[PDB]
Design a binder for this molecule. Structure first.
Ligand code: A1B92
Ligand code: A1B92
Lengths: 162, 272, 144, 108, 144, 144
């Protein structure tokens, strides 16, 4: 009588939030037909959610031709940092030695600052090398085996024949 | 031809930056005006006009900048594909998207003073309510669509997707550097940052939108409370429920539905 | 050519070179492609550098590299697109096409022409004078 | 369970690939025919006609790019099939044969 | 036969032959089946091509290809199934079954018969005269 | 060295030497690596043995690896890290670096010096008399 569930848009909103399992709001059916329809909607939504979960994990993966370019970009970007880190560590070592030996008076604040920067240089170099190794051993795993196996089979057959 | 190509690239990038700068200013001034109108000054004050003329001027300059940018990109197409007449580049899809961009970017609350009748059915009690609203509420909220320029600026300013050698290698491998490719790349390099920035931004945006919609038919300060809207959005994103807070307007229900769909998507992505 | 582009080319042009000898090697390319996850055959590796060369030495350098990098960066080149769409209908691969299947495909296979246009096309491009049509000569003649 | 049961079996993929290839072979020919038609018609209207009508030439130059893009897209779709088709080849089937051949070659 | 079926069969026969010669090669079939994702052995390919043939040599053409297309479209509710039914109990590949095996199988394995029917069946199938029943002749006798 | 520390490493050594020989060979290590999931080549195994080789002999006993231990738990070593830092810019692998390359990298790469510091560093590094600097001895001179 109050135009709640007899409103078209109210039914649309109710079905939308029952399919997705959010709740009921202020809208509950007054008849068993409404409850049956809502149960059907809920079961269908519970199935469809799992199906979409399966679908996204397949539709968000790169193809082979895209991997071949992703690896190239990553390598050509890491090669720069593996050199900046080494430049910094060499600079810090030279400055430490200079300020600790080739001077008349020793100032310890400068020496402490340089010895502090040396460790950061070492850590940065280590981290970048770790990332490079991860990229290499994660990239060298998508090579096919059927063609190489066929080639080896043909070579073995030829060697046995002759 | 390389110098001509470089000049075109630089000009296009600069125009994109200026367009973003001139859009964000309009959004911010709209936010301040809507906040202060429900309070200090009414719609008949001089501050209303003084703060809407700024919006109109920004819109005019933004339209000019977009048109100039599109002319530049048509010139770039002519250079790339080896054509002599500009009518070759004009297909139906290009015209449709240009018109859509103009139409979306050409909405704002125009200066004036107009009214409107609004009837709503209260929640949990089913009691009607009648008020008189402002026409600026229908014209102001659609302004959040301008946020697509951030994507353009970020894509154009990215050094990872701009090196000439990478483009040449991709062309040799016969692949295209479209938006699907860059999205798929960031979903592997760093998925946490991508899933976090979008969540926080949508969080504040939708929490403000619900309040701005629903402050009209609300007297007991439930959904017109900023923290109440934040809690509502949090428990609708995660599919826990509504508590004892339901929108009184269809705008609130639409915002909640958008939040729920986005939340289901994000949950599946985090599962992966 | 801006100096920035030249430097950007020289970087990653120094790639494919594990010794820095200022020259290319048919084994350095194989090592690089193995690093990126591929493993082409020896004939394919030879053809990769054969398709761009002008001295016959089997070794290219900075000029040829920049020559190929000038292209492979734009959009539709309007030459390879017509280089293909012949090999699709070319079976043996020598480079000749019979004058009957051309009429058949042009009259049947999608947005078909009419008899007048096909007859005019066959009357044109009659340099050979025989049924064996050289499609390579038809290119650089109909699109010169 | 639904992810377990979603996938096809081996004998079904062996015929799914056949159907897909049979469909793709026709489109890779229609696209090429359209490309060739557009090229010839552009050349005719721009050279052989005594007068020049630029609207027709412009329309044909517009259709040329459509034809090229369609051909490229269809060829990419055709390439995508082989990558997932050749991953169904077993290894233990030929492993024994290669092992036996190597053993025979070593023995004799 | 409607010309659409002939056209479809010709279009399919265009496959398996990447040479345009109109002749099925025992290597072309291997290449095609490798493309589809299978790697049959040489003996298996020989058996597959020798299952249906008219001329002595291993050559199949479109007239030799359209013969079994009609047969393979129906449901093989014929002696083909009885062939495997016999072969299930046939230990060796020669094609002979001992009579006592039939007695035990018919009297013990599933919806068993009565010994009268089994004796009648053996008496009717007394064509060998020794006990080494040839099932091919029995199949022809039963299904005629 | 505490009693617990002395008793330590004994189980690991017994794991390495699953024969009772009392010395570590180049085959038991391969078996252990295969057990743990790795398959190193013969050259890698030889180099791993050589890096802990006592004096010249191709075998490792219990006193040998006690020397290696208590060193792999010191975090920063301040010598090996500089070793890889030099090796990064070392191309051929002999162990010599040209002076011009050093000047270029120190004046361009990363945080940059000025010409005074670089000139002073080269002058102090002029213990070679040629372009090759022999950073190995330079490492000892710098680290004192
Ligand atoms: C990831 C990567 C790195 C290089 N790639 C690549 N290089 C190609 N050739 C060039 C010839 C001139 C050169 F000096 F640059 C040496 C290599 C050709 C080629 N292709 C074409 C054939 O289908 C496969 C892709 N790819 N791909
Ligand atoms: C996917 C595919 C494509 C072809 N397939 C296939 N072809 C077979 N033989 C044909 C008969 C007609 C012919 F003219 F083309 C000569 C070769 C036999 C066969 N079989 C039977 C034996 O168990 C394996 C499946 N499959 N399968």
């Amino acid at each position: 009588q109050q135009d709640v569930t007899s409103n078209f848009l109210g039914a649309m909103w109710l079905i939308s939030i029952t399919f997705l399992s959010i709740g009921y709001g202020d809208m509950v059916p007054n008849t068993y037909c409404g409850k049956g329809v809502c149960l059907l909607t809920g079961i269908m939504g519970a199935g469809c959610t799992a199906l979409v979960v399966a679908v996204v994990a397949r539709k968000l993966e790169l193809t082979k031709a895209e991997k071949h370019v992703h690896n190239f970009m990553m390598d050509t970007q890491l090669t720069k940092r593996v050199k900046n880190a080494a430049a910094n560590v060499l600079r810090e070592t030279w400055l430490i030695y200079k300020n600790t030996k080739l001077v008349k008076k020793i100032d310890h604040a400068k020496v402490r600052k340089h010895q502090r920067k040396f460790l950061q240089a070492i850590h940065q170099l280590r981290s970048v090398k770790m990332e490079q190794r991860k990229l290499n051993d994660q990239a060298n795993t998508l090579v096919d085996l059927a063609k190489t196996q066929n080639i080896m089979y043909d070579m073995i057959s030829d060697l046995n024949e002759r | 031809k390389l110098g001509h190509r470089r000049a075109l690239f630089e000009k296009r990038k600069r125009l994109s930056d200026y367009a973003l700068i001139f859009g964000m200013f309009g959004i911010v001034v709209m936010v301040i005006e809507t906040e202060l109108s429900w309070g200090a000054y009414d719609k008949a004050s001089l501050y209303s006009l003084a703060l809407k003329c700024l919006i109109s001027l920004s819109t005019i300059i933004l339209l000019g900048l977009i048109i100039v940018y599109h002319a530049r990109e048509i010139q770039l197409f002519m250079v790339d594909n080896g054509a002599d007449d500009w009518r070759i580049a004009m297909t139906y899809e290009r015209i449709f998207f240009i018109c859509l961009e103009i139409l979306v970017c050409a909405i704002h609350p125009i200066p004036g003073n107009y009214t409107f009748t609004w009837t709503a059915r209260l929640a949990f009690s089913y009691a009607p309510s009648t008020t008189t609203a402002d026409v600026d509420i229908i014209l102001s909220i659609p302004m959040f669509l301008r946020l697509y320029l951030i994507a353009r600026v970020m894509l154009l300013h990215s050094k990872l997707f701009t090196d000439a050698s990478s483009r040449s290698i991709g062309a040799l491998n016969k692949i295209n550097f479209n938006t699907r490719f860059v999205m798929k790349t960031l979903m592997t390099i760093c998925p946490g940052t991508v899933l976090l920035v979008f969540s926080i931004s949508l969080w504040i945006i939708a929490a403000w939108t619900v309040r701005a919609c629903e402050r009209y038919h609300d007297q007991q300060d439930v959904t017109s409370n900023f923290l109440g809207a934040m809690w509502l959005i949090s428990i609708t994103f995660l599919s826990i429920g509504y508590g004892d807070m339901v929108p009184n307007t269809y705008c609130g229900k639409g915002v909640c539905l958008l939040t729920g769909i986005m939340g289901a998507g994000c949950t599946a992505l985090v599962v992966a | 050519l801006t100096e920035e582009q030249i430097a950007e080319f020289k970087e990653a042009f120094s790639l494919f070179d594990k010794d820095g000898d200022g020259t290319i090697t048919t084994k350095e390319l194989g090592t690089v492609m193995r690093s990126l996850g591929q493993n082409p055959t020896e004939a394919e590796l030879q053809d990769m550098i054969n398709e761009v060369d002008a001295d016959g030495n089997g070794t290219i350098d900075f000029p040829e590299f920049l020559t190929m990098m000038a292209r492979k960066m734009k959009d539709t080149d309007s030459e390879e697109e017509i280089r293909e769409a012949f090999r699709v209908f070319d079976k043996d691969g020598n480079g000749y096409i019979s004058a009957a299947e051309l009429r058949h495909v042009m009259t049947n296979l999608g947005e078909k022409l009419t008899d007048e246009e096909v007859d005019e096309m066959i009357r044109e491009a009659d340099i050979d004078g025989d049924g064996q049509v050289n499609y390579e000569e038809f290119v650089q003649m109909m699109t010169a």
